[PDB]
């Protein structure tokens, strides 16, 4: 659901369409995704769900598809 969406929006930001986008993939602690990617995720959420204030931008809330999907739902 949110996860499917999340897993979709991440696809184009992934470094190669050959990268295992599992829900528990580590996106930032691993240097797979960078700030340019984080920007895209923030803009998606601002446009499709509830815009996030600085206090929700935590490595905890964004290091996995699952965590992001969870951040949006809580939000």
């Amino acid at each position: 659901s949110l996860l499917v969406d999340v897993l979709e929006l991440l696809r184009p930001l992934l470094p190669s369409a050959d990268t295992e986008l599992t829900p528990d993939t580590e996106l930032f602690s691993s240097q797979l995704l960078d700030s340019l990617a984080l920007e895209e995720i923030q803009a998606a959420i601002e446009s499709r769900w509830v815009p996030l204030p600085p206090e929700e931008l935590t490595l905890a809330n964004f290091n996995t598809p699952a965590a992001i999907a969870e951040t949006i739902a809580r939000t």
Partner: protein, 349 residues
């Protein structure tokens, strides 16, 4: 599972918020939120010689006098910087805990969670010693929103982190001691004092004082109040050269320097816009708790600053003309919402 440590866009503010909560003080609502501020700051050419003036620089602050001043005076305590000798560091951390706590400075490279082994960073990092970790090492609070949480460090590693060699940032035994526990009488007065601080800061804001000081780092120019953000935008138009310069492939070391420094000016500004959103959200929580939210109507200065923050992030991440113009429009909107909110609120105080 669900994290419980406080955090903020400036790591020292998030650290201070954890220490304030130990002694029954809500930093974001009663101290940051009680201090309504807006200031444009510039470092520029002044009286020769100024050897530390490396570049013309512009930024913004919503911190005003700052939490060290407000927290100290509101609690009747002290927020004191020292460089402690190594043989006194651990005793200082234990003695500070009884009355609040300590901000302990260290290099980025000392904090494994930052993944910065190859650089001490532009400025030193800060953590809050937080008792003994479950394995018997020292527990540390991280106050920056991105990294927020608790970490552990051995006593040996903590002393090595406080006394690095070499020491570019001069972190050697650097502590900020928060001896801030209010008396019972002072505790009962905190919301009364926070209401008085709120009015005093709104009066300073509307007074719109300006100042300038000649230093060996340059002429430091500042402007408070409603025209602070409009003045900031007028000054930032001067960095419109970054957009075409960042877009080129044939960049001299010099031009690459100009772009790196210009991108950093907007990165630093963006963190100040994040702090503004945080501080304005704190003000809205203070006002709500004081039963005054009727007097401000539904104005949302916290949302206008959040939008300005997002515009800043878009711009430093991609320096193009569309992104620069969007930031300026977001800041002009935040200025308008601020002055209307401030005039409406001060009428009810």
């Amino acid at each position: 599972s669900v994290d419980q440590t406080l955090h903020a866009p400036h790591c020292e503010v998030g650290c201070a918020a954890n220490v304030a909560r130990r002694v029954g003080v809500d930093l974001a609502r009663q101290v940051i939120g009680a201090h309504w501020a807006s200031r444009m700051l510039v470092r520029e050419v002044g009286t020769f010689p100024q050897p530390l003036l490396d570049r013309t620089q512009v930024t913004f602050s919503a911190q005003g006098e700052g939490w060290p001043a407000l927290l100290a005076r509101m609690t009747g305590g002290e927020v004191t910087s020292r460089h402690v000798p190594r043989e006194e560091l651990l005793s200082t951390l234990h003695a500070d805990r009884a009355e609040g706590g300590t901000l302990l400075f260290m290099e980025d490279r000392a904090c494994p969670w930052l993944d910065s082994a190859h650089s001490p960073g532009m400025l030193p990092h800060v953590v809050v010693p937080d008792g003994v970790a479950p394995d018997g090492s020292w527990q540390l609070i991280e106050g920056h929103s991105w990294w927020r949480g608790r970490y552990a460090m051995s006593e040996q590693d903590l002393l090595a982190a406080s006394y690095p060699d070499p020491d570019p940032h001069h972190v050697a035994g650097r502590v900020l001691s928060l001896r801030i526990r209010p008396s019972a009488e002072r505790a009962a007065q905190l919301d009364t004092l926070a209401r008085q601080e709120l009015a005093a800061g709104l009066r300073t804001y509307l007074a719109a004082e300006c100042g300038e000081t000649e230093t060996p780092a340059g002429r430091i120019v500042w402007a408070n109040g409603p025209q602070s953000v409009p003045l900031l935008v007028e000054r930032l138009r001067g960095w419109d050269y970054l957009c075409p310069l960042a877009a080129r492939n044939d960049l001299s070391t010099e031009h690459a320097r100009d772009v790196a420094l210009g991108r950093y000016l907007f990165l630093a500004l963006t963190d100040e816009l994040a702090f503004a959103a945080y501080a304005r959200a704190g003000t809205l929580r203070l006002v709500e708790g004081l039963g005054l939210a009727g007097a401000v109507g539904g104005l949302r200065p916290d949302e206008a600053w959040r939008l300005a923050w997002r515009s800043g992030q878009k711009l430093y991440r991609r320096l193009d003309r569309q992104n620069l113009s969007a930031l300026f429009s977001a800041l002009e909107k935040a200025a308008e919402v601020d002055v209307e909110y401030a005039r409406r609120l001060l009428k009810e105080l």
